[PDB]
Design a protein around this ligand. Structure first.
Ligand code: ADP
Ligand code: ADP
Ligand code: ADP
Ligand code: ADP
Lengths: 443, 135, 442, 442, 445
């Protein structure tokens, strides 16, 4: 029916109203202390008061680190911006890594704005331009004004435009008998389609047929918009959407990342604070999630120390699975989790713990019942012993070949023989290393 | 780029016709069912094979902004220079087109020939009608 | 289009119970690996699960790339199969994660339902009105069949399609409304007055009857990466061919994912996942593996297949050694298929199939000698000797490869071990690792 | 004329259906390598195989580059041949994988035959005929255009379409010019003013083509030869348009870009379609990569991937190393600097050093090619010196001997001339002896 | 031209006889008889022009005369023959590959020769009358050109009418029209009409009115290298790449087609080939990839004669981890011919110092010249060469014309050579920053 991929049996942290966690709730099994700590972090994010609070999730492989961050994102809801990331993604070839980190910092602070629009709309009834006296004079356009007659439901208006608006109108290829939509905030013109007041079946260019727009031609409507700070920074750094030459040629050239200056961010902050002061906008801080944080080097860590101390930064969540490893970009610095001690001093570490046989067995039960598979009890116990012997993920990933081998024998139940056949056909890391060690020519 | 004129050059020169433009100029007005016409028309055939002129637009930008205004208090020369740079008539005429009845007015009723018309119609064509605007 | 290395493999050679036949569809031997690949093929064909990694490992010249070619051949049409090598990721205009993202998104196809109208008839009269500079174009088309007759309206691109492949009011055309394609079927009126400005020899077809306009439904498949590149900027369709798509932003991908889910909701489009095959995966950085570990957990993820032929080797970008050259966190979330080396009967059958593919007649003794030298040396050397021996036998004006031709080819063209021995016997004549060589022979 | 290190080598000198003789084609010795290269040349002439690689290895100054150039001369100028050095793949514009793929695609040729029907000659009359019933509101409604053509021994009056008139006015064709009218499309163009119209006017500096020969109507069968890379860069670079992006890019630096696999697939399928019609013809060629020890292991792995492609040409490699580390690795000792996975995919041809009499005959042939006259005793001294130091040092010393002989107004080269030239110009060994026995930073 | 006195500007050719026998002191070169004879042989091989792709290596200790020998070859080579001189560090570009930079250096050193005939009509415009037919298809122009001595009237074609109505002349500009081809240029405005307009204008200039005959005949010989043709035939407007260097990795198809058309033009007789010399000073710092490309690139008929200079001993070749003689790999040294220079004695040093003193217009006494010769024997030669120029200024401050012994002694005291500097550093090493960054700035402890 649907598609399942390594997750999506997790819907939330599954906590009570007082913060205590049920053992089996929300798709989670075990990890009670980590779930309660993540609930405290979720409440801290929902308080919307703090800036630059950073935690770190530490533990071994297959212990439930990224599942907790995904559960945090599901608990917060879609109105809070959540920016997933991998530590290898900060190494770009177009811009420096510091700018990529600051862009992903600004991408995690949302904004809700109740803005208003001025709209002229209706069906075009006439289109007559008036020429200039000296067309070849070098200065000034060919035309001077264009008379446009618009007709809507219980209304009719006549408009006199400059050549600037008419240039965008004729760029939209507007004829007589079309329904248009002029937005006065930017001069943008949208051609909705042919009107249905005329014949329909005599066209050859797959158009759509639109009724007459209701209400008057001139209108004022309120639109609720959800944007981030990075959207404003990008739209101001590379200007598009105006009717001038510079914003028109900006849509045609190839886009490229640029080092946004601090002055532009300060001006955008000033304008956004002015919008909030009028009661129009409202700030929604969010979460930045950097997975595999050991891939970063010392320069990004040293810039992260500076960037966490700013007065706008969101809540940062990191994850790592290294014991005591050298930091990348250095030679002698040995630190826990691959994170330097000055950054470790600014964190709050949440420990994650390994599982047992019972938790592995019920996790296999949950993953089997998510994937619409029916497993026998003896096969379930065999898979639980397999998971404790080798790996949890190897037992989880062997469910679908077992189901296929059961289906190819015209059967619905998964039995022990299917699990034995899947053991024979597919290997794991330890048996592959055993084959690699006793082999002739670098297998 | 705007007032580039394709004037003729004398043959007694060091410049040649390499095989790239020896293939380029042949298929300018070539019809279909030709060998060399169809061997250089891969992009249009791939366009019309995949029904790309009836597809829907999936992405629109979030914020659109005009260029940052520069103001100097008490100087009309700054306003004139900024208005000349933002709304230069040559490039604005190049990215637009003259109306047809206006063209008939300056050609027949005023005697201006075709070759001294300002250059027009240089804006690129969008993929669909759906891709022409952000609304 | 030519005779290639894996041109003799057409499928996997399996039954309905996924039991591999001993020799079928150009594949011999390797029953467990073929059965496992058939299970993976059924897993792809069901299309209900995402982000599963399969690793194919073994010694060199064993049939990993042959197995991947068999999987891609049995996968069928219109299902994407992206095959890349490990060294294509390192680029000068794209980061490694961006190139890996594009390679992941190229392997998921979107099948879109479309509604079109087909118009075929006989052209009566064409009227085209253009401005003085030729910019604005409009006009009316009068087309007819044996029963009906209609006057249509034309736009810019319809007029541009009519000006090319010039129609002369009596040609029979067919128009697709959604695709916008003009096809001239032929000439039916056979007019008398013809001027010498045209040199075509247009065919005599009949005037069509029945309905002028018909309704049709068409289905086409477009990958996710094409949709991203098209929606990225103004002229993305050219960048689909020139490769000038530099680091598409994440907002584009988020909005495309939401739009694709919306199209799936309305019944307009459906999702057909495919296979991404990364051959020679050991030539990848540690950052690529760290990206793959999180890219496999997404909703829109294909079935990733990797192949390698390394033992406990050094991982690139690190200073330690790992099994297969891959780190253990990636190996935890992968499923390993192991391939075994070949017998002599399998080698003889391989050589016979490759000889039949290259259209070479072989004797029994020549095949036995080729089997013996393919057992002693590698298999690929004895497979390469076949065409050379065929040309040598053709030089003597007989179309049958004999033992003397195989002996001559073995004499002329060397092995790896023979060349190593000849280098080590005369090491002063070659340039050493210290750059010393005796060029004088005295 | 002008000679440079070669050009005494014309072909391989093999007779038909047979072995290579002793002195033929400017080649002395090297019988087995010449026979192997003849077999390879016959295999390339068969035009069936794809991605066959050979590697010819030996000491310095043995004739590997000579054998590759002899292969290219034996194949002919119709078959493409792309010479290359291994250091050329490292560019600063695109990745080395893209450069290798471009050089791969440059070695496959296409032969296209076509029939062109044209009209040409001097313009005698040009009258747009008025219509019988003109329309109101319009000036000069045209029903046909009468154009009279005149050439050498021919004159024909044509009737044209009315829509040729604006193409006539666009090309500003007047009476007395020479035009060029395609049959099916019209599409006139001004070749130039007729050369009989140069003397009536004192200052008229348009070009003056002669009056064309033959009739005004001719069907010429042209044959055009292109490679697949030309089609790829023609289709990727956008055609002549009117948008400001194309005219902007035509004036800028033509930056290389990564051509996608989709464009190559579309080019391949349209080429296959036109080949199946019997119009086109595919000519595979030879890509010659010299000094392959300069390649990196990423390029070797991508070569391993790309040699199994459908349309790869025949690749010829050459090296002069022994047991050397592969570049980009640390501890891979490999023969000829080539990793073993690539070594398994090719056949090795061995080149052996020469003797005293072979060196003497090579020196004699290089002397008689450079139009020099050498005495026999000087030839014996030069052969002894070439045996003592190097063959190449003996070959490089011929021209200073000729100059010193011409300074004394002589034609024969005398023993004292080669003694003076040996005294004036050193070799590697004597310079190394000078370097080791001094302490003045030399 | 625009030049000051350079390091070796006293050298004008190699001082050789008609038998390639070097005179002891002629044309600014002293000593080095065998190297000068070898360079004369190389010069004759260049002037013959039938031998392509030869590598010559000049090896010696520093301050011996390798680049002086190359300067002598360049001066005696003569005009209109291309001589490209680059250093080894120039090929490490950011927007060009090393192979492409070496190809552009190789193709700059071989050129073709083109001669053309010019029939110029240069004068001052008096009056242009533009007349058109009733149909308008035919345009005639009454052109009244005028020089100082005479004046005539021509009839212009419609193409001249179009070419003059663009960049319009205003009856008193100076123009020149080629009769045979039709090149149109506007030189400027006459000086006789420089007082009537009261302000200049943005794009005008005043030139003198030409004198003499109105119609003149002259032939011009042009020398065009192959790199110019490669740059021109690769783009729409390529001369900007000729003057700004933004060529950017030209393809191989254009080079092959240019080679083919140059060969067929040599066959037709329109152009003839002029080969030249490429000189790579300080060749030892090239990568091993550059050496492999140089190995393969010398086997083409369109290749110049390459001259290299090295002063290294048995050093490490860059890009590798071993050592080789001259810092060059053995397969390149196999493809080479070595000219060896030797260090000078007292008499040659004395003659070189006297020549450099005469070059710089400095008057030396006998005792000052003997002291400078002794210093140049003990220290290097360039130290005495620089001591000459500073001792001239020291003696000029003393209100004296000729340099005495005391000025040379004062210049020896004020300026140090390498040996005394090494001694003074080694005896006071605590005050200098070491390899580990340790230093003692404080003077007391
Ligand atoms: N408490 C849990 N309940 C259910 N599934 C879990 C739990 N913990 C881990 N898993 C599963 O085990 C896998 C662990 O991977 P993940 O948590 O993403 O990163 P890591 O491998 O570093 O722990 C996930 O696929 C997740 O679905
Ligand atoms: N079972 C098989 N059927 C057909 N051909 C095979 C088979 N096994 C190996 N080959 C041949 O061996 C070669 C593949 O070897 P290779 O690609 O090196 O495998 P791997 O890359 O996994 O080591 C191909 O030439 C293929 O034709
Ligand atoms: N068998 C031969 N007959 C004639 N000339 C030869 C022969 N072998 C080598 N040469 C000459 O020796 C020169 C150098 O040989 P080359 O092929 O450059 O050596 P390498 O194989 O190291 O590149 C060439 O100019 C070639 O003309
Ligand atoms: N034979 C010579 N005749 C005249 N001056 C010479 C001679 N040899 C060297 N010099 C002078 O010595 C100085 C340095 O010599 P140079 O040519 O730089 O040798 P190198 O390049 O080996 O250092 C130059 O100023 C040059 O004028």
């Amino acid at each position: 029916v649907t598609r399942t991929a390594a997750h999506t049996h997790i819907k939330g942290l599954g906590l009570d109203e007082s913060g205590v966690a049920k053992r089996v709730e929300g798709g989670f099994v075990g990890q009670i202390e980590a779930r309660e700590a993540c609930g405290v972090i979720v409440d801290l994010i929902k308080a919307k008061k703090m800036s630059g609070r950073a935690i770190l999730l530490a533990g071994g492989p297959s212990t439930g680190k990224t599942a907790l961050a995904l559960a945090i994102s599901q608990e917060l809801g879609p109105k809070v911006p959540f920016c997933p990331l991998v530590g290898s993604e900060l190494y770009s070839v177009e811009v420096k890594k510091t700018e990529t980190l600051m862009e992903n910092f600004r991408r995690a602070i949302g904004l809700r704005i109740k803005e208003t629009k001025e709209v002229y709309e209706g069906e075009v009834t006439e289109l007559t331009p008036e020429d200039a006296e000296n067309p070849l004079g070098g200065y000034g356009k060919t035309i001077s004004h264009v008379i446009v007659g618009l007709k809507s439901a219980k209304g009719t208006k006549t408009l006199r435009l400059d050549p600037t608006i008419y240039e965008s109108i004729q760029r939209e290829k507007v004829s007589i008998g079309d329904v248009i939509y002029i937005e006065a905030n930017t001069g943008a013109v949208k051609r909705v389609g042919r009107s249905d007041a005329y014949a329909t079946e005599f066209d050859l260019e797959t158009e759509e047929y639109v009724p007459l727009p209701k209400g008057e031609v001139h209108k004022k409507k309120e639109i609720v918009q959800d944007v981030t700070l990075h959207d404003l920074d990008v739209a101001n750094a590379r200007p598009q959407g105006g009717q001038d030459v510079i914003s028109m040629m900006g849509q045609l050239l190839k886009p490229k990342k640029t080092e946004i200056t601090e002055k532009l961010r300060q001006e955008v902050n000033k304008v956004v604070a002015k919008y909030i002061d009028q009661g129009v906008a409202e700030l929604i801080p969010g979460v930045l999630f950097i997975d595999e944080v050991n891939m970063l080097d010392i320069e990004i860590f040293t810039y992260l120390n500076k960037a966490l101390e700013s007065n706008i930064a969101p809540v940062v969540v990191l994850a790592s699975n290294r014991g005591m490893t050298t930091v990348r970009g250095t030679e002698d610095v040995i630190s826990p989790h691959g994170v330097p001690p000055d950054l470790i001093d600014r964190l709050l570490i949440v420990r994650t713990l390994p599982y047992d046989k019972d938790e592995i067995r019920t996790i296999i039960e949950r993953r089997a019942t998510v994937e619409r598979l029916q497993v026998e009890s003896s096969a379930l116990d065999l898979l639980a012993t397999m998971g404790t012997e080798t790996s949890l993920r190897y037992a989880l990933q062997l469910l679908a070949p077992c189901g296929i081998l059961a289906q190819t024998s015209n059967r619905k139940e998964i039995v022990v023989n299917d699990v034995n056949e899947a053991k024979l056909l597919f290997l794991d890391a330890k048996r592959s290393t055993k084959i690699l060690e006793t082999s002739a020519n670098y297998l | 780029v705007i007032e580039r004129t394709n004037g003729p050059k004398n043959t007694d020169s060091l410049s040649f016709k390499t095989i790239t433009q020896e293939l380029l100029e042949v298929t300018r007005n070539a019809p279909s069912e030709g060998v060399m016409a169809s061997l250089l028309n891969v992009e249009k055939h791939a366009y019309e094979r995949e029904y790309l002129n009836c597809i829907q637009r999936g992405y629109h930008p979030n914020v659109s902004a005009p260029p940052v205004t520069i103001e100097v208090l008490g100087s009309s020369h700054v306003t004139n220079s900024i208005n000349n740079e933002l709304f230069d008539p040559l490039i604005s005429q190049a990215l637009s087109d003259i109306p047809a009845i206006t063209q008939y007015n300056m050609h027949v009723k005023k005697g201006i020939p075709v070759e001294d018309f300002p250059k027009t119609g240089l804006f690129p064509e969008p993929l669909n009608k759906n891709f022409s605007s952000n609304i | 289009s030519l005779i290639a290395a894996h041109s003799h493999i057409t499928g996997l050679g399996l039954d309905e119970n996924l039991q591999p036949r001993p020799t079928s569809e150009g594949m011999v031997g390797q029953l467990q690996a073929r059965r496992a690949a058939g299970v993976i093929l059924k897993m792809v064909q069901n299309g209900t699960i995402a982000g599963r990694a399969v690793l194919v490992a073994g010694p060199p010249s064993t049939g990993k790339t042959a197995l991947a070619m068999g999987v891609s051949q049995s996968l069928g049409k219109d299902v994407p199969f992206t095959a890349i090598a490990g060294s294509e990721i390192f680029s000068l205009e794209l980061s490694k994660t961006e190139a890996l993202t594009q390679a992941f998104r190229k392997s998921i196809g979107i099948k879109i339902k479309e509604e079109t109208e087909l118009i075929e008839g006989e052209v009566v009269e064409i009227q085209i009105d253009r401005s003085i500079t030729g910019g604005h174009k409009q006009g009316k088309l009068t087309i007819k069949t044996t029963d009906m007759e209609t006057i249509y309206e034309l736009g810019n691109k319809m007029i541009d399609g009519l000006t090319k492949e010039k129609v002369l009011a009596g040609d029979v055309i067919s128009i697709d409304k959604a695709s916008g394609k003009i096809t001239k079927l032929g000439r039916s009126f056979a007019r008398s007055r013809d001027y010498d400005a045209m040199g075509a020899d247009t065919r005599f077809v009949q005037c069509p009857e029945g309905e002028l306009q018909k309704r049709k439904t068409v289905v086409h498949t477009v990958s996710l990466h094409e949709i991203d590149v098209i929606n990225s900027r103004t002229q993305g369709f050219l960048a689909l061919f020139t490769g000038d798509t530099g680091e598409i932003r994440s907002e584009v991908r988020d909005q495309i994912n939401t739009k694709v889910a919306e199209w799936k909701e309305e019944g307009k489009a459906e999702i057909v996942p495919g296979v991404l095959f990364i051959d020679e995966v050991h030539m990848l950085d540690i950052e690529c593996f760290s990206f793959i570990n999180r890219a496999l957990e997404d909703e829109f993820a294909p079935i990733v297949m990797m192949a390698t032929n390394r033992g406990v080797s050094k991982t690139r970008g690190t200073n330690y050694k790992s099994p297969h050259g891959l780190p253990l966190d990636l190996l935890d979330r992968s499923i390993i298929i192991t391939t075994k080396s070949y017998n002599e009967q399998e080698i003889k059958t391989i050589l016979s199939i490759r000889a039949q593919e290259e259209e070479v007649e072989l004797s029994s003794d020549a095949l036995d000698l080729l089997t013996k030298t393919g057992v002693e040396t590698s298999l690929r050397y004895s497979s390469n000797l076949i065409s050379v021996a065929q040309q040598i036998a053709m030089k003597r004006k007989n179309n049958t490869v004999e033992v003397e031709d195989v002996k001559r080819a073995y004499l002329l063209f060397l092995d790896s071990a023979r060349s190593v021995k000849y280098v080590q016997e005369n090491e002063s004549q070659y340039i050493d690792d210290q750059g010393n060589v005796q060029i004088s022979i005295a």
